[PDB]
Each structure stands twice: as structure tokens, then as C-alpha cells.
Design a binder for this molecule. Sequence first.
Ligand SMILES: Cc1cc(-c2cnn3c(NCCN4CCOCC4)cc(Oc4ccccc4)nc23)ccc1C(=O)NC1CC1
Length: 260
Amino acid sequence: ECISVKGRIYSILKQIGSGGSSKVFQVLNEKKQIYAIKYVNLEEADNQTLDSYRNEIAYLNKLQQHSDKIIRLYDYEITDQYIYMVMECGNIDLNSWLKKKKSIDPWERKSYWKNMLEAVHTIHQHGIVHSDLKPANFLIVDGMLKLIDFGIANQMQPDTVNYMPPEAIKDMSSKISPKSDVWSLGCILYYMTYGKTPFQQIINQISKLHAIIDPNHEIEFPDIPEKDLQDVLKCCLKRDPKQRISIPELLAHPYVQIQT
Ligand SMILES: Cc1cc(-c2cnn3c(NCCN4CCOCC4)cc(Oc4ccccc4)nc23)ccc1C(=O)NC1CC1
């Protein structure tokens, strides 16, 4: 099949992702340059969904300039029937790359952590809190991690509640701040370090949600060479968000600033 966007015509290689009424395709332009196109079918979309898609496109647009750790938006086309967004294609999403690697170079993990903090910090500066970060939200391209979305519109999945923060659960029934994203980033780094998510081994959602909120449930951190890392994990995974480390701090931390 093919897709046209503002004139230009693109050929579908395959479908790399899917969600409610939308699909992401890997595609090629005329000069055989590769891109990711998101297609949103708006035909039965409520005004809230409509507005959330409008808000994503606008934020994606504005944030272009502020970091190259945010996915590139080259062009889009929006009508009443559909959206098409032409964006950069990556090598692999971080959630897939994590299941395949299964022992991560410490240098690559540290570099990737910086990439994530910078992307997320960037959206925090424009008043966004993602609130649902997980490794699927990040994408490897060149040698760096880019943020794919902002938690604004429907989440897509590649063709998952380990990462939820305590404030969000105790929220019911706002306590959501930028710290909420630190928690989820905490969990992602934990996974890249210990090879699992802090509350992964717990068995059935409903119990795990109590654990996540329960102070007495001591979260455990095996000792490891890198103590900068160990400290980062501890600081991100504090349950009281007022005492949780912030992203500006994280960026000032030896784990990020100091190599070897
Ligand atoms: C959802 C989305 C996805 C990409 C994208 C761009 N490349 N890419 C890739 N890379 C290629 C992976 N593969 C395929 C087979 O092997 C060879 C290479 C995977 C992927 O997997 C996914 C798929 C879904 C969810 C997460 C991750 N999503 C994307 C860019 C933007 C958006 C998006 O709508 N953002 C919102 C507007 C703000």
C-alpha cells in the first residue's frame, strides 16, 4: 500500500505499531528515505480524543527546537476523517531492545539514562508531565534514546504497570507532579540495572498496587560496583514525592556528570 501526505507519497514497509484507531507504519519516501508514519482514524472520535490528538501534534511541533532527544516531526496532514504524521523512524524501541540484550554495558546504560532525563526534562519545561512512562516510550536512533510521546494522546504499542507511581494510586480518590515521571524513570533504570522492575516478581496486579504504596514494604537494592547508580535508584524510588529526587538534581548527579 501507499500513503500521501501534503503531496508526497510514501510506501508502507510494515506496521510497527498499533493502538485504538491508529497505526504506525515504517515507510519509504520517493528517494527511499525511511520514516515512521502515524495514521489516526478520526471517524468515530469524540471531542476529547480529537482534542488530545490536536494537543500532541501542537506539543510535538513546538518541542522540535528545544531537544533532539524528542522524535522529529517532519510533516503532518489532519482533516476530519484522518491524521497522518510523518516522523523519524528509529532502529528499535527500548522495550524490545531490553528483552534481547539481557546484559547491558554500564556505559550504554548511563548514556541512555542521560538521554531520557534530558528528553523528559524538556517536556517538564513546557508544563507536560507524561505520567505513564515506560520503556516503550523511548526509541533508539543513531546512538541515543529519543522520547516518542508525551502521554497526551492514546498510547500505542509495538507490533506494563510496573512503572506506576505511588502518587497516582493514592490519588484515588491532584498529587501528580513532575516527580511522578522520576519514579517511572527510576523503574526503567532499575530494570536496566537489576534486570527486573522493582515490583516485577509480585504476582497479581491488585497486591502489587498495595506494595507500591506501602512504606513498610522495603524495596531492595542489591549492592553493585557503581554506587552513583545505586544512589540514583534509591533517590528516584522514594515514595514520598516531596523527598523524591527531581530531574534538575538528577542532572547534577555524579552518575550523570562523572564518568569512571
Ligand atoms: C507511536 C510512535 C512511534 C514512532 C516510531 C518511530 N520508529 N519506531 C520504531 N522503530 C523501528 C522498529 N523496527 C520495526 C521492525 O524491525 C526493524 C525496525 C519502533 C516503534 O515501536 C513502537 C511502536 C509503538 C509504541 C512504541 C514503540 N515506534 C517507532 C514514532 C512516533 C510515535 C508517536 O505516535 N508519537 C506521538 C506523536 C507523539
